[PDB]
Amino acid sequence: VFNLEGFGPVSRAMGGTGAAFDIGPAAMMENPATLGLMGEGRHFSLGLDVVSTDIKVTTASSGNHGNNNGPYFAPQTAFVYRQGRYAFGAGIFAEGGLGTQYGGSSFLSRTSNGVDTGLDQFSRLLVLRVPFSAAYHVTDKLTVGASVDAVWTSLNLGTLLDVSQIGTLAGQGRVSGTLVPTLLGVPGLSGGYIDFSGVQAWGIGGRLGLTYQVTPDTRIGAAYQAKTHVGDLTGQATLSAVGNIPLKGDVTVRNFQMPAQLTVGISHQFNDQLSVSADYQRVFWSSVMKDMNVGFVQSGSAANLDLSLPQNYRDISVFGIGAEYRYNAKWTFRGGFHYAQETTSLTGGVSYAIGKNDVIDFALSVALRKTSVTHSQVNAVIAYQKRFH
Numbered sequence: 328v329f330n331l332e333g334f335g336p337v338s339r340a341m342g343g344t345g346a347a348f349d350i351g352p353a354a355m356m357e358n359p360a361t362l363g364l365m366g367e368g369r370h371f372s373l374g375l376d377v378v379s380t381d382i383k384v385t386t387a388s389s390g391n392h393g394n395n396n397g398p399y400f401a402p403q404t405a406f407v408y409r410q411g412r413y414a415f416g417a418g419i420f421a422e423g424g425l426g427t428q429y430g431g432s433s434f435l436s437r438t439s440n441g442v443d444t445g446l447d448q449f450s451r452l453l454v455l456r457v458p459f460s461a462a463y464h465v466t467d468k469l470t471v472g473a474s475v476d477a478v479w480t481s482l483n484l485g486t487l488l489d490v491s492q493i494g495t496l497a498g499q500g501r502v503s504g505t506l507v508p509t510l511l512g513v514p515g516l517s518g519g520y521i522d523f524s525g526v527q528a529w530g531i532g533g534r535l536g537l538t539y540q541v542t543p544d545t546r547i548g549a550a551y552q553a554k555t556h557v558g559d560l561t562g563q564a565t566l567s568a569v570g571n572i573p574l575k576g577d578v579t580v581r582n583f584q585m586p587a588q589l590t591v592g593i594s595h596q597f598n599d600q601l602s603v604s605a606d607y608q609r610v611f612w613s614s615v616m617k618d619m620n621v622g623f624v625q626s627g628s629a630a631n632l633d634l635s636l637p638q639n640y641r642d643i644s645v646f647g648i649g650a651e652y653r654y655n656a657k658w659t660f661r662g663g664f665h666y667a668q669e670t671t672s673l674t675g676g677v678s679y680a681i682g683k684n685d686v687i688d689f690a691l692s693v694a695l696r697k698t699s700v701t702h703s704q705v706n707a708v709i710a711y712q713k714r715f716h
């Protein structure tokens with residue numbers, strides 16, 4: 328729900344699509360019902376995801392500065408056992424990769440008046456999901472599936488919060504803690520620099536969906552992703568306002584929610600070479616209407632500083648389309664397009680069968696340019712899969 332390129336080489340290479348198509352073990356993260364579309368035997372998957380973001384804000388620019396905001400390379404492994412009407416599997420998929428690392432010599436450093444620096448502007452969100460799923464042919468044409476995952480969410484930024492003063496415009500009611508004394512006092516005027524470093528949390532998520540063989544050549548499906556339940560993000564941070572003001576203590580974040588998700592899609596085989604998929608996805612960010620407050624405790628002491636962040640978003644809809652072309656017995660080509668709004672990326676991938684039971688797959692998603700703030704984005708994925716039977 329944070330990026331949205333789909334999981335695995337097949338899905339990424341086919342527009343993030345996957346509701347009614349067999350996209351491999353990654354199905355555990357999309358539509359669990361899709362497993363069991365796979366062939367009997369045991370399947371092992373091994374690969375890694377890479378997010379390459381480049382951002383230019385004017386002239387500041389995190390993206391790929393030098394060598395420390397480089398790309399996160401998250402590993403992914405998966406197991407799937409197929410037998411008769413059954414499918415069982417577990418995996419470790421590392422979604423999330425929206426990190427930034429601007430310098431220290433630019434603005435966003437320059438504060439609401441003219442002062443500078445600090446440890447400066449960065450930000451990183453990492454999310455691990457360990458799904459345990461099952462898929463069952465309830466019929467020769469109906470297959471349901473589901474998966475419950477353990478989730479590891481880990482973020483941490485480095486940013487300034489001026490908003491002048493006021494603390495919520497003024498007497499709003501949000502900001503205000505029994506340590507908000509240094510605030511107002513001190514004697515700087517502009518430069519709240521928090522430095523999470525580091526605030527994870529173990530949560531629980533899950534999903535279930537179905538596929539229905541309308542015809543031997545057309546399949547449909549739908550999947551529903553429950554609202555993730557991440558719990559509190561705890562971590563030792565070091566706040567510091569602005570001369571300059573240093574501080575230290577561990578912070579707690581409550582209500583960092585991940586929206587529920589609904590997905591319906593279609594797949595059709597036009598012959599033994601070409602197949603096409605199309606999915607519709609809705610991300611209910613409208614249901615994340617709660618308060619997200621950032622707490623600040625410090626030593627053995629009870630110095631406080633709460634800040635509530637209003638959360639009012641709107642549902643996001645994304646449409647996807649992809650094709651899988653079986654060029655021949657060992658080369659498969661995939662391409663697709665992914666559109667999100669209410670935001671656009673070309674998709675491609677190639678699979679090479681190193682003989683049956685063994686296949687290397689490489690997929691990549693390229694975002695189109697949006698614009699100030701302009702960013703480029705590339706999502707590469709490479710996986711190795713071997714089945715035993």
Ligand SMILES: CCCCCCCCOCCOCCOCCOCCO
Binds near residue numbers: 521623
């Ligand atoms: C609709 C898409 C939203 C996706 C973005 C979710 C990421 C939001 O921010 C998470 C970090 O929390 C921000 C906190 O405020 C800044 C620091 O805290 C203040 C000091 O007490």
